[PDB]
Every structure is written in C-alpha cells, then in structure tokens.
Design an enzyme around this catalytic site. Structure first.
Site, PDB file in Angstrom:
ATOM      1  N   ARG A  66     -36.756 -14.753  -3.457  1.00  0.00           N
ATOM      2  CA  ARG A  66     -37.611 -13.641  -3.842  1.00  0.00           C
ATOM      3  C   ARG A  66     -36.973 -12.279  -3.629  1.00  0.00           C
ATOM      4  O   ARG A  66     -37.652 -11.275  -3.861  1.00  0.00           O
ATOM      5  CB  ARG A  66     -38.934 -13.718  -3.091  1.00  0.00           C
ATOM      6  CG  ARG A  66     -39.845 -14.812  -3.627  1.00  0.00           C
ATOM      7  CD  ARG A  66     -41.161 -14.754  -2.873  1.00  0.00           C
ATOM      8  NE  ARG A  66     -41.058 -15.451  -1.611  1.00  0.00           N
ATOM      9  CZ  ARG A  66     -41.947 -15.352  -0.642  1.00  0.00           C
ATOM     10  NH1 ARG A  66     -42.989 -14.560  -0.814  1.00  0.00           N
ATOM     11  NH2 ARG A  66     -41.783 -16.028   0.490  1.00  0.00           N
ATOM     12  N   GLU A  93     -30.564 -27.609  -2.913  1.00  0.00           N
ATOM     13  CA  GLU A  93     -31.434 -28.403  -3.789  1.00  0.00           C
ATOM     14  C   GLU A  93     -30.657 -29.532  -4.447  1.00  0.00           C
ATOM     15  O   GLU A  93     -31.129 -30.675  -4.516  1.00  0.00           O
ATOM     16  CB  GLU A  93     -32.072 -27.528  -4.868  1.00  0.00           C
ATOM     17  CG  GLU A  93     -32.729 -26.290  -4.329  1.00  0.00           C
ATOM     18  CD  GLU A  93     -33.318 -25.435  -5.423  1.00  0.00           C
ATOM     19  OE1 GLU A  93     -34.328 -25.875  -6.041  1.00  0.00           O
ATOM     20  OE2 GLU A  93     -32.774 -24.331  -5.659  1.00  0.00           O
TER      21      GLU A  93
HETATM   22  C1  HEM Z   1     -33.082 -16.436  -8.878  1.00  0.00           C
HETATM   23  C2  HEM Z   1     -32.881 -17.454  -8.029  1.00  0.00           C
HETATM   24  C3  HEM Z   1     -33.975 -18.328  -7.353  1.00  0.00           C
HETATM   25  C4  HEM Z   1     -33.722 -19.111  -6.299  1.00  0.00           C
HETATM   26  C5  HEM Z   1     -32.353 -19.211  -5.569  1.00  0.00           C
HETATM   27  C6  HEM Z   1     -34.934 -19.802  -5.930  1.00  0.00           C
HETATM   28  C7  HEM Z   1     -35.106 -20.687  -4.886  1.00  0.00           C
HETATM   29  C8  HEM Z   1     -36.223 -21.478  -4.638  1.00  0.00           C
HETATM   30  C9  HEM Z   1     -36.255 -22.671  -3.814  1.00  0.00           C
HETATM   31  C10 HEM Z   1     -35.069 -23.295  -3.049  1.00  0.00           C
HETATM   32  C11 HEM Z   1     -37.505 -23.145  -3.802  1.00  0.00           C
HETATM   33  C12 HEM Z   1     -37.948 -24.410  -3.054  1.00  0.00           C
HETATM   34  C13 HEM Z   1     -37.939 -25.446  -4.156  1.00  0.00           C
HETATM   35  C14 HEM Z   1     -37.612 -26.825  -3.674  1.00  0.00           C
HETATM   36  O1  HEM Z   1     -37.167 -26.991  -2.509  1.00  0.00           O
HETATM   37  O2  HEM Z   1     -37.793 -27.763  -4.485  1.00  0.00           O
HETATM   38  C15 HEM Z   1     -38.339 -22.303  -4.640  1.00  0.00           C
HETATM   39  C16 HEM Z   1     -39.700 -22.459  -4.905  1.00  0.00           C
HETATM   40  C17 HEM Z   1     -40.423 -21.724  -5.846  1.00  0.00           C
HETATM   41  N1  HEM Z   1     -39.894 -20.692  -6.599  1.00  0.00           N
HETATM   42 FE1  HEM Z   1     -37.959 -19.840  -6.530  1.00  0.00          FE
HETATM   43  N2  HEM Z   1     -35.915 -19.415  -6.827  1.00  0.00           N
HETATM   44  C18 HEM Z   1     -35.364 -18.526  -7.730  1.00  0.00           C
HETATM   45  C19 HEM Z   1     -36.050 -17.936  -8.781  1.00  0.00           C
HETATM   46  C20 HEM Z   1     -37.401 -18.048  -9.044  1.00  0.00           C
HETATM   47  C21 HEM Z   1     -38.125 -17.457 -10.168  1.00  0.00           C
HETATM   48  C22 HEM Z   1     -37.479 -16.598 -11.278  1.00  0.00           C
HETATM   49  C23 HEM Z   1     -39.417 -17.804 -10.050  1.00  0.00           C
HETATM   50  C24 HEM Z   1     -40.624 -17.440 -10.957  1.00  0.00           C
HETATM   51  C25 HEM Z   1     -40.637 -16.385 -11.761  1.00  0.00           C
HETATM   52  C26 HEM Z   1     -39.556 -18.617  -8.845  1.00  0.00           C
HETATM   53  C27 HEM Z   1     -40.735 -19.160  -8.371  1.00  0.00           C
HETATM   54  C28 HEM Z   1     -40.866 -20.188  -7.441  1.00  0.00           C
HETATM   55  C29 HEM Z   1     -42.070 -20.931  -7.180  1.00  0.00           C
HETATM   56  C30 HEM Z   1     -43.420 -20.700  -7.868  1.00  0.00           C
HETATM   57  C31 HEM Z   1     -41.816 -21.847  -6.254  1.00  0.00           C
HETATM   58  C32 HEM Z   1     -42.890 -22.814  -5.738  1.00  0.00           C
HETATM   59  C33 HEM Z   1     -43.038 -22.469  -4.279  1.00  0.00           C
HETATM   60  C34 HEM Z   1     -44.462 -22.145  -3.938  1.00  0.00           C
HETATM   61  O3  HEM Z   1     -45.331 -23.036  -4.099  1.00  0.00           O
HETATM   62  O4  HEM Z   1     -44.713 -20.994  -3.488  1.00  0.00           O
HETATM   63  N3  HEM Z   1     -38.304 -18.736  -8.255  1.00  0.00           N
HETATM   64  N4  HEM Z   1     -37.517 -21.289  -5.122  1.00  0.00           N
HETATM   65  C1  LIG Z   2     -36.643 -21.153 -10.586  1.00  0.00           C
HETATM   66  C2  LIG Z   2     -36.157 -22.114  -9.521  1.00  0.00           C
HETATM   67  C3  LIG Z   2     -34.946 -21.946  -8.861  1.00  0.00           C
HETATM   68  C4  LIG Z   2     -34.562 -22.877  -7.887  1.00  0.00           C
HETATM   69  N1  LIG Z   2     -33.379 -22.696  -7.265  1.00  0.00           N
HETATM   70  N2  LIG Z   2     -35.340 -23.959  -7.577  1.00  0.00           N
HETATM   71  C5  LIG Z   2     -36.539 -24.124  -8.209  1.00  0.00           C
HETATM   72  C6  LIG Z   2     -37.516 -25.236  -7.984  1.00  0.00           C
HETATM   73  C7  LIG Z   2     -38.853 -24.878  -7.911  1.00  0.00           C
HETATM   74  C8  LIG Z   2     -39.856 -25.827  -7.759  1.00  0.00           C
HETATM   75 CL1  LIG Z   2     -41.563 -25.262  -7.687  1.00  0.00          CL
HETATM   76  C9  LIG Z   2     -39.512 -27.171  -7.681  1.00  0.00           C
HETATM   77  C10 LIG Z   2     -38.168 -27.549  -7.767  1.00  0.00           C
HETATM   78  C11 LIG Z   2     -37.775 -29.019  -7.658  1.00  0.00           C
HETATM   79  N3  LIG Z   2     -37.287 -29.307  -6.282  1.00  0.00           N
HETATM   80  C12 LIG Z   2     -37.779 -30.612  -5.821  1.00  0.00           C
HETATM   81  C13 LIG Z   2     -35.808 -29.296  -6.202  1.00  0.00           C
HETATM   82  C14 LIG Z   2     -37.182 -26.578  -7.929  1.00  0.00           C
HETATM   83  C15 LIG Z   2     -36.941 -23.205  -9.179  1.00  0.00           C
HETATM   84 CL   LIG Z   3     -34.179 -29.573  -9.039  1.00  0.00          CL
END
Ligand code: HEM
Ligand SMILES: Cc1cc(N)nc(-c2cc(Cl)cc(CN(C)C)c2)c1
Ligand SMILES: [Cl-]
Ligand code: HEM
Ligand SMILES: Cc1cc(N)nc(-c2cc(Cl)cc(CN(C)C)c2)c1
Ligand SMILES: C[C@H](O)[C@H](O)[C@H]1CNc2nc(N)[nH]c(=O)c2N1
Ligand SMILES: C[C@H](O)[C@H](O)[C@H]1CNc2nc(N)[nH]c(=O)c2N1
Ligand SMILES: [Cl-]
Ligand SMILES: [Gd+3]
Ligand SMILES: [Gd+3]
Ligand SMILES: [Zn+2]
EC number: 1.14.13.39
Lengths: 401, 401
Positions: free
Chosen positions: A108, A282
């Site tokens: 974020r 991831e």
């Molecule tokens: C630019 C680089 C970004 C990185 C490195 C990143 C990283 C991550 C990671 C590691 C997670 C945990 C997911 C998992 O472990 O499966 C996550 C969750 C999430 N990300 Fe990001 N993300 C990025 C961009 C974004 C963008 C552009 C959006 C939406 C506009 C976003 C929205 C979310 C949402 C909605 C979740 C679900 C978590 C929750 O329930 O609050 N991310 N992100």
């Molecule tokens: C935009 C974005 C970047 C990032 N770096 N990761 C994610 C991600 C988010 C959600 Cl909500 C779920 C998953 C699936 N995970 C089990 C690996 C990946 C999304």
């Molecule tokens: Cl993934």
C-alpha cells in the site's frame, strides 16, 4: 484509543482512525478470531453521504457549494431510482481509497499511483474480454509492471451482475489425476473443471494457463482464451544451482485479482479486477512450497544434498531460501518487476508512518503483513497493528456457481 | 455461537465450543482487532467454586462426597479469614491447567508432565534463594531438562509480596557506553542498572550472567550470586563454519520465567517461576538476531561472505538459518534438551487434536504459535486458531516498581 508500540525502536502511537471503523468484524472481548481467513434506501444514503464527505475532504472543498449540491443530488437520485451514479473523479478516488484501506495488502505504499480504467459502459461478455486484454496489456508493459484496475458496471436493481469467475486473470490448470492426485496447481481444481465443463479442451501440463470465464448480466458464463503473447511468463532458474532449470518451473508476471467486490459509497462493483506486481514470497514460498500447492520443497532439498531425515538439519528452511532466491533472480533476469519481503516490509513501515500523519492510523492485519518466511527479520514483525474495516473497500464475495 | 475453525492444508473443519467460557475479557471488539498487541472483597468465592468444580470433574469425582465437602471448607475458610489455602493436589492441578491454558505457549503437548515444588512455607529472600536453586538444579539435571514450577506463598492484603525482580532466572548483563550503545543484552539494561545500583560488580563482557534480585514482603531486595556450577551454558559452534566458534557466542540452557503471576482458583502468586526447555528459534532468531537484542545477523553474514549490498540476495535469511543450525548443533553436542520449530509445531498440532477430543478446543494465539522463521513451512501456519482466556491462568504483572 488503541496504543500501538514498535518493539524494534520502542516508539508509541495511538490509532485514532480505528474509532471510525464502520462495518464491523469477527472478534469480541470473549474471543479473538483475527486468524480466520474469511471472517433499504436509508443505509445506501448514509454510506453515500459518508463517501461524498470523504471525497470533498480530499479535494480541500469540504462544506462548499459543490459539496452540498452533490448530497442533494445523490439523495434525489436514490429517491427517484433507488441507486445513484459515481462521477469519474469520484470513482478514481474511491478505487484508490479502497486499495489504501485494504488491511492485508503490504503493497500500500503505492496506493496513490493507480491507473483506473472505467469500463462502466460495458455491455457484453465480449466487450468485457476486450477491456480485460487491454488491462493485462497496460499492466504487464513488457515486464515494467504498472498498478491498474478496471471497473465494470455496478450492481443495480433489475439486472444481474457482471462477474469474472476466475480468481485471477492468470491461473494455471489443476487436473485431478488418475491416482487421486493433481497435475498443475491444486488451488485451481474447481475452476479448471468449470472451464472443461464449458467447452475448454484441457491440456495436461503443470503450467497450462486457463481460459477466462466471463459472466454478463443474466447470461451463462462465456469462455475466452487469452492470446499467448499477452501472458508474460518467467522461467525459473537459480543463479548457482544449475539443475534448478531442469525442474521446468515457471510463474507468470502479472498478479491480477478478479473475484473481489469493490464497494464505493454503498455501491457495489462485483467485477473490478486489479493488478500490481508480485512479492517474491507469494511465488517462492506459498505458491511453490505450500504442501497443498505445487509442494516442491522436498524435491528441491533432495536435489540440494540436504539430509531430509531429521528436521533439526533445517532442510526445509534451507531449500525454501534457495527457492526464493531463484524466484528473484529469475524475475530480474527477465526484467520483470518484483519486490522481495525485505524491501516490501520496509516500505510498508514507511506507509504506516505516512498514514499515521495523514489519517491518524492505518488498518493492518499483522498475520498477513508479516511474510511467511523470515518474519522477525522484517521490521513489521516488531510493529503492533490495529485491524479494522474502512469503506471504500474490497470485499470477498461468494463464487458465482 | 461456536467458531468454525478450518485447516487450509488439509481442509478439516472443527468447532471451538470451549471458547464459550472465557473470563477476563479480551482486548478485541467488533470494531477493531488488537490480537497483535503484546500486553493488551468476596469476589474470591466465585473463582474458588469453579476451580474446585474443575478439579473434581477432572478426576471423575464431581458431585460426590469429598467435592461438596471441599466446597464447604473453602466457604468456611474465606468466611472466617477472607482467603483460603489450596490442597496440595489442587495447587498441582491448577499449575498444570494454567500451562494447558497459556495461549502463546507452543510446548503445551507437555502440559501433563509438570513437577510442582510447594514453596508456600517461605519467608526471607535467603530462603527463596535455596528454593530457586533446588528448582534450577532439578530443572537443569545436567542438560536433560525437566519442566518444573516453584510456587511461593500466595498473597493477602495488609502485607507485601514475594517477587523475583528478573524476568528470567538466567539473564545476561547489559552495559551502556560513552555513547549510549550497549555491550551485552539490551533487553536487560534496566535490571542491570538495578543490580549495579544495589552494589554489584559489573563485568566487561557480552555474556555475564546477572545476579538475582529477590524480594521478601515489605522488605528491600537482596542480591544473590548464582552458583556458577549451577548455570549451565552452551558455547555456540557451527558444524561446518569453523570460524563461528571464534565469534564467542553462548546461550544458557534453562529458560525459566520468573516474573509472571500464577492465578489459581482466585488466588494470586506473584512469584511462581516455571521452566521447560528452549525451542531453538527463541535463541537463534529472537535473542541473537532481533535488531534490539544481540543483533548479530549482519556480523554473521560478513563471515559467510554474503552480499550485504542488496536485500534481494536474501543474505539475512541465509545468515539466520545458519545461526539456527549452530544453536541446534551446539545444544545437541552439549547434550542439552532443545526442540526445533518443525518438531515443536508438529507436536502442537498434535496437542490441538488431543484438546479437541478432551475439551472441545484450545486457546491458541496464532501470532506466537507460528515460529519467527519459516512460518508457512510449519503446519500451524495453515491452522486457523481461536484466542481467549481460561482459568487457572498465568498473567503478566507490573514490574515491582
Ligand atoms: C503494487 C504492488 C502490490 C504488492 C507488492 C501487493 C502485495 C500484496 C500481498 C502480498 C497481499 C497478501 C496476498 C496473499 O498473501 O495472498 C495483498 C493483499 C491484497 N492486496 Fe495488494 N499488492 C500490490 C498491489 C495491489 C493493488 C494495485 C491493489 C488494488 C487496487 C491491491 C489490493 C489488495 C487486496 C484487496 C488484498 C486483499 C487483502 C485484504 O483482504 O485486505 N494490492 N497484497
Ligand atoms: C494485486 C496483487 C499483488 C500481489 N503481489 N498479490 C496479490 C494477491 C491478492 C490476493 Cl487478495 C490474493 C492473492 C493470492 N494469494 C494466495 C497468493 C494474491 C494481489
Ligand atoms: Cl498468486
Ligand atoms: C517444555 C518445553 C516448552 C517450550 C518449548 C515452550 C515454548 C514457549 C514459547 C516459544 C513461548 C513464546 C514466548 C515468547 O515468545 O517469549 C512460550 C510462552 C509461554 N509458556 Fe511455554 N514452553 C515450554 C514449557 C512451558 C512450561 C513448563 C510452562 C509453565 C508451566 C510454560 C508456560 C508458558 C507461558 C505462561 C507462556 C506465556 C505465553 C502466554 O500464555 O501469554 N511453558 N512457551
Ligand atoms: C518455559 C518456557 C519455555 C520456552 N521455550 N520459552 C519460554 C518463554 C516464555 C516467556 Cl513468557 C518469555 C520468554 C522470553 N522471550 C523473550 C524469548 C520465554 C518459557
Ligand atoms: C490460517 C492462517 O491465518 C492463514 O493460513 C493465513 C495466515 N497468514 C497469511 N498471510 C498472507 N499474506 N497470506 C495468506 O494466505 C495467509 N494465510
Ligand atoms: C507486535 C507483535 O505482536 C509482537 O512483535 C509479537 C509477534 N509475535 C511474537 N511471537 C513470539 N513467540 N514472541 C514475541 O515476542 C512476539 N512478538
Ligand atoms: Cl529467552
Ligand atoms: Gd553450481
Ligand atoms: Gd575469508
Ligand atoms: Zn482479534
């Protein structure tokens, strides 16, 4: 006002933003459930009231002409139609705040650099596919990834939802096997069946990209193959262990989540895929080493000469560190954006500082922010956090089938 | 009303009915989750009934002769004197159940093997000291470690309290310099100042064992040098990095926590030190690598010739694993009981199934059961958990000043 300490440094703040958490979550004073993965015109008005207030605060025009006008406007449209329409700038702001408010997102720091594509004029599953291909193309950008979101028409009275059935735009098939096992990625067993059931000719590799299943209102889902040259992939090699390329492993460049619901001021966009870039853990740890995913850990460790007979040798921790090294080297060899858990958590700490000065706090889910290897080596391990739900927001939603 | 709890590695689903009880309300509310925070007359009778009711159901003896009888004697004991004494087996039963209820303890598969030393007929620090010393030498047992707790007298009004002023019984010195920065353990800097304030000779070392400050009711503390043949320590060597030995690191064998308050049946013992054996990551990852502790990680990485000039080489992850390998190796060669985080987490899963069968659940604090390296490589990572407060319990308590 929850007091929050950083234990690496000793510093202390209070999360006053938590005191305005609107929609409520799963814990009580009897019991914490933080670790669980998945925990009326008048209410539409008061959600919309609240978002409008937000938006006019962020343009430094609170209490102004335009502000009260837009309240009067939005109420008149809810009275006459039961819903209302976001202006375009309001939509860009609400999608950025949704990212900002996402408690489990470590990425974020970037929340303000987001490319919003307005697909709210979309009309069929076919136009939908074109907007999606455009999104993938803009975001991939030949490996120099950009953060993007495409917003398809809002849920509304009288008509069904647009839906993307795939959890992400890029996913690999998971074929249940002869002897009860799974070829490819086992997390995608169900959607893989759905695809075959809807006319997809399956493959039988471990890294077969799945077609898209796209749902136009009141329509069955329609199958769409992604053009091969749109899906940038990355062969995995290890800078020193040269047998590692003989595993044949790959991952794709673009993480594009497509099954989440975006909520802005009471309106609900059940199809609004978004994409950024991967954090190496991831791919390296979860997607490849999870026992219920590709589960390569033992195979790497055998190859590495490690003694896998006792756990006290720490073969798992060693093999897993080299799997991550391979993922970062591979993505840098291919010139594809990627961030490691140390850089990612360090900039997330900057995000918490920026946010404490801006809104007096920041919703954060400690168990999801802390990486799945080397937790206490990152600085977020030693940061207490307050978890809560702000709107605008991305919500999970049940599967359309 | 009964939390659904899932295991993601396997798909199994259980329900925590035990969560129904929960006395001391937890810090979380429906509006915000605070799970990540480290430290979040005749009331005595209700706490006393329930504890006695537990005891007798645990011996297939609820609702039979000696149970109703024992209910009367405590009725009369508090009626007459406003407090009560515990039957020796009850004290034994409470100490074991408290351990069984410690949500952040990953070693509770061992909970039924606890040696309780009754030190209730105690008075003066010079006597506590030999009670502590019998514990230490019984616990240590020449490296074949054994779980023990020593319970000092309970508490009453109008009178002072027994307190051990150190957090552990074995703590290393922490000295400042002509520049604030610390030689020795920075965790203990504060209690190191007191020992020196109370007339103790400061050493010149990174690994000087501190002396106990023991305190008798209404009396000042009194220093005590522990017998140097009673403090079993393990020099740290790596099985193949021959230079690691020369780094001159050591840790002590006996983790013995001397600052929590045992609360059984409504009575509070502010002095009740317990001990078990270490899990290896406690020493290798938390104590020797935390930025605010010994912080050796970068000095080990130079010796392994790793590239510290970019975090994408994962040098931190690399150096941390070898530190942990050296801890496990050094302890096993010293023939001192130690458990690696893989072995321990698997046993804790086994505990969770035991307790689901026995008591329909288990309070567990996800953030502390998951180890601080290689988290998602252990099964507890993929286990959802419910956190709540049962009695009898161990509680944190104000420092004696
Ligand atoms: C630019 C680089 C970004 C990185 C490195 C990143 C990283 C991550 C990671 C590691 C997670 C945990 C997911 C998992 O472990 O499966 C996550 C969750 C999430 N990300 Fe990001 N993300 C990025 C961009 C974004 C963008 C552009 C959006 C939406 C506009 C976003 C929205 C979310 C949402 C909605 C979740 C679900 C978590 C929750 O329930 O609050 N991310 N992100
Ligand atoms: C935009 C974005 C970047 C990032 N770096 N990761 C994610 C991600 C988010 C959600 Cl909500 C779920 C998953 C699936 N995970 C089990 C690996 C990946 C999304
Ligand atoms: Cl993934
Ligand atoms: C036998 C081997 C044992 C192991 C491997 C073990 C392991 C651990 C670990 C890793 C923690 C986390 C604490 C921290 O991170 O600072 C912990 C906490 C704790 N342990 Fe154990 N422990 C053992 C035995 C015991 C015994 C004998 C007792 C007392 C009878 C006990 C009671 C506690 C308590 C009260 C906590 C505080 C956590 C809480 O409930 O908030 N443990 N233990
Ligand atoms: C009996 C026992 C065994 C073990 N393996 N660990 C502990 C422990 C408990 C607490 Cl409450 C605090 C600490 C110290 N931490 C700073 C590492 C250790 C206790
Ligand atoms: C059960 C447990 O809470 C679950 O496996 C969570 C833990 N933390 C996580 N953290 C991240 N970033 N991603 C995840 O999928 C999970 N899984
Ligand atoms: C802020 C955070 O809750 C805190 O650093 C916790 C996290 N998990 C932990 N886990 C263990 N075992 N020990 C700890 O001290 C901590 N610290
Ligand atoms: Cl310790
Ligand atoms: Gd080679
Ligand atoms: Gd040399
Ligand atoms: Zn909680």
């Amino acid at each position: 006002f929850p007091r929050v300490k950083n234990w690496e440094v000793g510093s202390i703040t209070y999360d006053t933003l938590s005191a305005q958490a609107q929609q409520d979550g799963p814990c009580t004073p009897r019991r914490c459930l933080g670790s669980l993965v998945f925990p009326a015109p008048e209410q539409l008005l008061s959600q919309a009231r609240d978002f409008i207030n937000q938006y006019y605060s962020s343009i430094k025009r609170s209490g102004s002409q335009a502000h009260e006008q837009r309240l009067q406007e939005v109420e008149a449209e809810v009275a006459a139609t039961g819903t209302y329409q976001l202006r375009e700038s309001e939509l860009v702001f609400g999608a950025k705040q949704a990212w900002r408010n996402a408690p489990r997102c470590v990425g974020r720091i970037q929340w303000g650099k987001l490319q919003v594509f307005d697909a709210r004029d979309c009309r069929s599953a076919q136009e939908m596919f074109t907007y999606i291909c455009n999104h993938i193309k803009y975001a991939t950008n030949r490996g120099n990834l950009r953060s993007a979101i495409t917003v398809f028409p809002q849920r509304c009275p009288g008509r069904g939802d647009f839906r993307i059935w795939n959890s992400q735009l890029v996913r690999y098939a998971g074929y249940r096997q002869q002897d009860g096992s799974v070829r490819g990625d086992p997390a995608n067993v169900e959607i893989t069946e759905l695809c075959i059931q809807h006319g997809w000719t399956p493959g039988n590799g471990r890294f077969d990209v799945l077609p898209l299943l796209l749902q136009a209102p009141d329509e069955p889902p329609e199958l769409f193959l992604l053009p091969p040259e749109l899906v940038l992939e990355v062969p995995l090699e290890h800078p020193t262990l040269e047998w590692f390329a003989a595993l044949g492993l790959r991952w794709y460049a673009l993480p594009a989540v497509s099954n989440m619901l975006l909520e802005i001021g009471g309106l609900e966009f059940p199809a609004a895929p978004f994409s950024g870039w991967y954090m190496s853990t991831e791919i390296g740890t979860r997607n490849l080493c999870d026992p219920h995913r590709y589960n390569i850990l033992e195979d790497v460790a055998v190859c590495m000469d490690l003694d896998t007979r006792t756990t006290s040798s720490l073969w798992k921790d060693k093999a897993a560190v080299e799997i991550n090294v391979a993922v970062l080297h591979s993505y840098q060899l291919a010139k594809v954006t990627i961030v490691d858990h140390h850089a990612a958590t360090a900039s997330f700490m900057k995000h918490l500082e920026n946010e404490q000065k801006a809104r007096g706090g920041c919703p954060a889910d400690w168990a999801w922010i802390v990486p799945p290897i080397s937790g206490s080596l990152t600085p977020v391990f030693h940061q207490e956090m307050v978890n809560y739900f702000l709107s605008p927001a991305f919500r999970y939603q049940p599967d359309p089938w």
